[PDB]
Symmetry: D2
């Protein structure tokens, strides 16, 4: 397995960036997974944005805290290769994991949500322990959608030797810390966002600026402009993690 992991797809520039560049590189990977938490004009996922991702070559789409902004998501969750955080409570729509099959090899993908500085949910560590006991595969990729670097690092060491790779998202800025932990698991704190960086985490500068300055609510406004494609490549060969490499593409 040759896997491409694509950093948070941010609003219209992000979706455009994927649609435009993925086709030119899809051939380089066996499987492509992407976080599409903000794919629907910045907030969530809808049928349209899902389609453009799939049509661009994405095989599986993960969500996050915004996983419920749009109704259409519930249809995507029951019949499409779309997953939400594993560690929502029982009775939650959709699945918290997915099994990808390619070339006779299997890859178990799992997204989990951190709890520090975020909403209360089930314990990510033990939810992972249980899952990994019931679902076996050639490779296991765990995406940790969290705010705290310590929580992301805690989960990764905890997963060392069990997961083939642990990639973080949510923070929107790509980190220069791609490495392999003592027991072999690959790791990166944040993949980064795929969208226009001529903004503040996807939103229009002055909008966010107005929030910090006035202390008064300011409706989200997706920024528009040239985008950056952010992703991380994972090389899984012979049931063992081989290499991890961040990837960047600047839209012309």
């Amino acid at each position: 397995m040759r896997v491409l992991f694509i950093g948070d797809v941010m609003a219209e520039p992000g979706l455009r960036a994927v649609g435009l560049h993925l086709p030119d590189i899809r051939d380089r990977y066996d499987l492509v997974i992407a976080n599409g938490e903000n794919a629907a004009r910045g907030k969530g996922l809808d049928r349209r944005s899902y389609r453009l991702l799939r049509e661009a070559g994405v095989d599986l789409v993960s969500l996050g805290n915004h996983a419920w902004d749009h109704k259409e998501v519930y249809a995507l969750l029951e019949s499409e290769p779309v997953v939400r955080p594993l560690n929502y409570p029982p009775g939650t729509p959709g699945k918290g994991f997915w099994r990808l099959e390619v070339g006779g090899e299997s890859l178990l993908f799992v997204q989990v949500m951190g709890r520090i500085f975020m909403d209360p949910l089930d314990d990510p560590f033990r939810a992972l322990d249980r899952l990994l006991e019931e679902e076996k595969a050639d490779y296991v990729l765990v995406e940790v959608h969290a705010e705290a670097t310590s929580e992301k690092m805690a989960l990764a060491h905890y997963l060392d030797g069990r997961a083939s790779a642990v990639l973080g998202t949510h923070t929107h800025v790509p980190t220069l810390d791609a490495t392999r932990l003592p027991k072999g698991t690959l790791y990166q704190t944040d993949v980064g966002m795929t969208g226009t960086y001529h903004s503040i985490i996807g939103g229009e500068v002055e909008t966010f600026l107005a929030r910090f300055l006035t202390g008064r609510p300011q409706p989200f406004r997706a920024a528009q402009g040239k985008a950056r494609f952010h992703a991380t490549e994972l090389v899984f060969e012979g049931g063992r993690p081989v290499a991890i490499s961040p990837y960047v593409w600047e839209e012309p």
Copy 2:
């Protein structure tokens, strides 16, 4: 000028990293600044921590949230080139800024602390406005000690054209987004930590994992092991920001 900014010096490994390597590249810079908020066994700063950094070639040390862990910091704040967050309220020991002087040129260094997911402090945006209104220099470097990426980015844009460069700390992971904002101000979300990465943000893996698994307090133990020196180089010339470059060195 040519300035080197060194990412949070974390406990004994971080201190060794600076003492062992800084001497070797010291002559390539006019000014060397370092965040020493975790220099003392991972918590705050004390006289020994301070002397070591100085002996290595550090010209100025900044703090943050752990600034008040050791009473020895007061003497330091009182008569040494050590600074604390500008945006503490009136009646706070020490200074929140420092105007360095070298070969006839001046560099105003200021550290502000974010408020999102952190303690309630004064408005850093307007705190900076008041300072920059009365304090002038050839160049200005602002360190933003904050948790949220949106807050660091908001502060950078808000200072764009006024500050020569804006660097983020507190996260402990180097980000790959060193760039030049519209009005010329250089920026990087997080310089990264200086210390052993065989840990959880400098803390012993076993210790942090226990906190996360049990939800019960666990006294902080500083991880020990090979270190990584993390810094960011800045080039200011002709009264303008020329370049910004993430720097790394692995301890043999």
Copy 3:
């Protein structure tokens, strides 16, 4: 001067409860102040809800975090006896305080917002310092809209001997701790909510239950039912705070 303070007016039952009962006891007071943060269907204040409050016999209306929920508030803020939290940043619409005149005697009303478990606003302690320094009156009433009971008690003690009384809001639950501080200042942790208690914090029980059980988004729905009028009577005389008495009236 005999003052009535009315606990958070919650959505339609709250507006009703006041419109019904206040006219029957208005005689008993010289001045009446109300928190209308949740007046307009539980979220904010607008022309209609405001008008209903004045007609019921309210002389001044205060808000809080939900102040900006309806843009109709702005007009109200610049021409009507409506005040928002004092500690918002410079340039914030509306006044942070208001002077009430009743038979020669003057009453300075001030609303302050806590920062613990809330948003990063200006320092409320020093904010009051600057105000009470440049604004005098026979009596001073400070409302503390905050979440943490420690912050309310600290603000109260800090104002002891300065404010005639300090009353807390935001909790939506009446507290039984009305008393006199060491230096005379009257105090109660939370006045209580004015609206239907057949709900959770004024919202439908089911909606809120769904939020805690699913961890997923649930739009706010104002509960309906018998209202329970909550307020606190303040007796200031001879320039000195004499009494404080919580008041309750259940809708028949």
Copy 4:
């Protein structure tokens, strides 16, 4: 059955109030339960603290967030009738429930901890469902130690008709809202704390005021002075919750 539930015993004063008064009214109740997470100098519980509580007439002691401040607590958790929140992770020391018995009738007492504005723990709602299936008793008393009133109420309604009574703690201020829910379950937002009220939630006024003004750490210090004994009387007859009444005692 007549049960007396004492509010959080705060340090020396609180501990004194219980020892002096409880022996006087002890005969007026069948079971006496007390929150003692602040009994030992305002920081957790210990042998001395526990002995004094038992010798005072307390049959069971509950804990909370500070349950782990003292090493001696673990031994108490193993043999003595002391409980910590049920909603900690599996493998946690001690129990989160306790079966009391008095002449034929049985009482299941449970303590859960809220999560809003607090630490990440297991889902208290579903934790209660599971416990209530395996543990049955004539009456059930659930203590909700939390910050958010909305969470305490949501839990109360979730237990309505299932729990005999639901009492909240952690806020340190008695609420005037004791009542009966639609399905008979008795409820009160906060029993209030037992200790000297001439302080900010049990702590020295000056100390807490210093924290709020400086924004710098100040070691906790328990206030000393005349105490207020806060509790709530519960009456369970014919297999249903009959009466709930707040209870106060000013120290001579």
